[PDB]
């Protein structure tokens, strides 16, 4: 869960100048660091971030010795991210003229990690190096650095402004590649990112993540067969964990504001009645019949909680998606560390899949939870198989509405040209591509992979208010709109069909 990340940067003059047609590497590194710290701040994962810079005039390190380990400062110790860190990177981080070798930076970073790791359970450690490799390399301690990195299990990631470079940059890249091969090997080559690539990925706030609670129960078929099962919530409408707090406008404190409830009677005198004299009731037609809470509990419908029983089995065709109810989907696997239960569940899943059947079941979360009738159907994949449970409607929840037929409507009968135009529009606006080589469908616009814009907007506005206490909120970010819209190709291809449809179909507002 926890993670200690030491971000190592440089302020050498070699980044202070660059081609005017592109942003300076120093600016790119600053933006990457800012985005990372913003994501960490707005994602409460209890990770720790330290900041070290090599290539500065000053010298402040735990280890000094002689000329070695010089011109490096531990700007920010290892602690939780905060807006103070954002202010520090905004202003405190300044360019410089002195150069420095990144090997000394790496050794000091590992020294800081080793010194500050003790006392906390940081199961992961990462070192990110943002350098241009313009300075010369003092390759004299590679064996020991590799040995220490392997012993301490500390990961390494590098960022460069290129994915037309000087020979010094080529030599630096080669040494970087060798270090990565020694650390991991082939896969290390995928850990060398560019500033543009990092900017592309880190342009969105971390999505809200919650851990589902394992729900143990027993799947019963009759009264003699029971299979231990564990259920987890898979799909649900995620909300914001935090909620707005009502505070006074002047003192900016929530301790001076409180809520009160007042009960009175329907009379001119406006008599006041205490809470103890208030009873519960219901309306039965044109009258009101008292129904006290104690009597309601006494006469309430009592059922045994935590029940997962198989009412029966029915053909999949009889269960339609439009009837699905509830606000959640459950994934049911076998009990953890239980081979017999796994075998039984696999047998049931395979039987249902082969016979094209689903199980109508009764589900109750606990004693206080109302009973539900739902459908469980198999879900078999190349690697995992389980059951998927979704609630089903009751008799009272069905609505019988009658709608006029459109197929046999003389007034609204489309013509052949209109149908051809609609067909052209549908073909032009296709959101799936059929690759013939593999004969497979590829999704051009995967909606499931789009983060919720609501949380992005909320976090952006909160950040803007925090960093700018007195300023109007900004507009919606362009990238949010881009990700909420289809690729430009679909829009371009659909213009002519849309114009033809507009020409063919007369639409008049009333």
């Amino acid at each position: 869960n926890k993670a200690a990340v030491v971000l190592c940067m440089d302020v050498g003059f070699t980044m202070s100048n660059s081609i005017p047609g592109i942003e300076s590497p120093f600016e790119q590194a600053k933006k990457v660091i800012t985005m990372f710290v913003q994501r960490q701040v707005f994602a409460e994962n209890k990770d720790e971030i330290a900041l070290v810079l090599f290539g500065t005039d000053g010298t402040d390190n735990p280890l000094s010795g002689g000329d070695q380990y010089q011109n490096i400062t531990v700007h920010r110790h290892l602690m939780l991210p905060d807006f103070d860190l954002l202010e520090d990177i905004e202003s405190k981080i300044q360019p410089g003229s002195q150069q420095a070798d990144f090997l000394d930076a790496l050794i000091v970073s590992m020294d800081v990690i080793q010194h500050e790791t003790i006392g906390k359970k940081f199961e992961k450690r990462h070192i990110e190096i943002f350098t241009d490799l313009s300075s010369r390399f003092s390759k004299s301690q590679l064996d020991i650095i590799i040995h220490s990195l392997k012993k301490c299990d500390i990961s390494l990631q590098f960022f460069l402004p290129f994915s037309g470079i000087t020979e010094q940059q080529k030599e630096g890249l080669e040494i970087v590649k060798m270090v990565m091969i020694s650390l991991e090997g082939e896969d290390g080559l995928d850990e060398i990112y560019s500033f543009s690539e990092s900017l592309r990925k880190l342009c969105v706030f971390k999505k809200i993540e919650r851990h589902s609670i394992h729900w143990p129960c027993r799947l019963t078929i009759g009264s003699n067969l029971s299979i231990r099962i564990a259920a987890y919530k898979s799909i649900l409408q995620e909300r914001v964990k935090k909620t707005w707090t009502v505070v006074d406008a002047k003192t900016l404190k929530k301790e001076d504001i409180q809520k009160e409830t007042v009960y009175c009677l329907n009379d001119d005198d406006e008599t006041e009645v205490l809470k103890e004299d208030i009873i519960q009731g219901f309306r039965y037609g044109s009258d009101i019949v008292p129904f006290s809470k104690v009597d309601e509990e006494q006469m309430k419908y009592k059922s045994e909680g935590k029940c997962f029983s198989v009412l029966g089995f029915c053909k999949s065709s009889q269960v339609q998606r439009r009837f699905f109810m509830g606000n959640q989907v459950l994934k049911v696997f076998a009990a953890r560390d239980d081979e017999a239960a796994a075998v039984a569940l696999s047998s049931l899943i395979h039987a249902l899949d082969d016979l094209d059947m689903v199980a109508i079941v009764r589900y109750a979360y606990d004693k206080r939870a109302n009973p539900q009738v739902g459908v469980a159907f198999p879900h078999i994949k190349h690697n995992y198989e389980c059951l998927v449970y979704v609630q089903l409607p009751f008799m009272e929840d069905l609505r019988q509405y009658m709608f006029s037929s459109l197929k046999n409507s003389k007034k609204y009968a489309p013509t052949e040209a209109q149908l051809n135009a609609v067909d052209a529009l549908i073909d032009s606006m296709s959101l799936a591509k059929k690759d013939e080589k593999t004969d497979t469908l590829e999704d051009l616009f995967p909606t499931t992979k789009i983060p919720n814009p609501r949380f992005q907007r909320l976090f952006q506005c909160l950040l803007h208010r925090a960093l700018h206490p007195r300023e109007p909120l900004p507009p919606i970010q362009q990238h949010i709109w881009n990700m909420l819209n289809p690729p430009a190709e679909v829009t371009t291809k659909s213009q002519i069909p849309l114009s033809k449809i507009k020409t063919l179909f007369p639409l008049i507002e009333a």
Binding site: V5, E128, S155
Partner: peptide, 7 residues
């Protein structure tokens, strides 16, 4: 396998 700065 996103890990480190991407996780």
């Amino acid at each position: 396998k996103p890990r480190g700065l991407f996780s």
